Amino acid sequence: MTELETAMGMIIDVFSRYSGSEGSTQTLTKGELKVLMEKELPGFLDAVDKLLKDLDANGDAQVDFSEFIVFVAAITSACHKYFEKAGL
Template structure:
C-alpha cells in the first residue's frame, strides 16, 4: 500500500493540485511506472481513454481514489493472465503424461 501511495504522490502535484494527477502527470506515471502493463501508454488516444475512464467526477484530473481503481483493475487483469498461463502449462503437462 505504501508503494502505491508513494508512486501516486511522486507524480501528483508536479503541476497544479498536489493531490491529483493532471493528464500530463498521469501520462508520465503510466509510461514510467506501468508501461509494461498498459501496452502503448505513449499513445495519446490511449492516455485520453484511461483518463476518461478514471476521471469519474469529470474534473479533468485523477485523484487517489480514481487512481486506485486503475491499480485494482490492472491487478485483476494480471491475475487473470497469470492464471490462464498456469492453466495452459498444467494442460500441456497432463498431455505429456498421457
C-alpha cells in the same frame, strides 16, 4: 512494516511522486498521468487522454487517488486472472 502494508505504502508513494508537478497536489492532470504511465507502467499505453476520461469518475478532468487505486487494482486483478487460467 509488513509486506502488504509496504505494498500499499508503495502505491501511495508512486502516486505522490507524480501528482505534485501541476494543479492540485492530490490529483493527476493529463500531463502528470502521461509521465506516471511512461515511468511506472511503460508499454501499457490519444491513449493518455482516453485513459484519463476512463478513470475520471467525477468529471473534474483529473485523476485522484481513489480513481487511481481502482485502476491499479484492475490491472493487478487482470494479471492474476491470466496466470490463474494459464494454470490449467
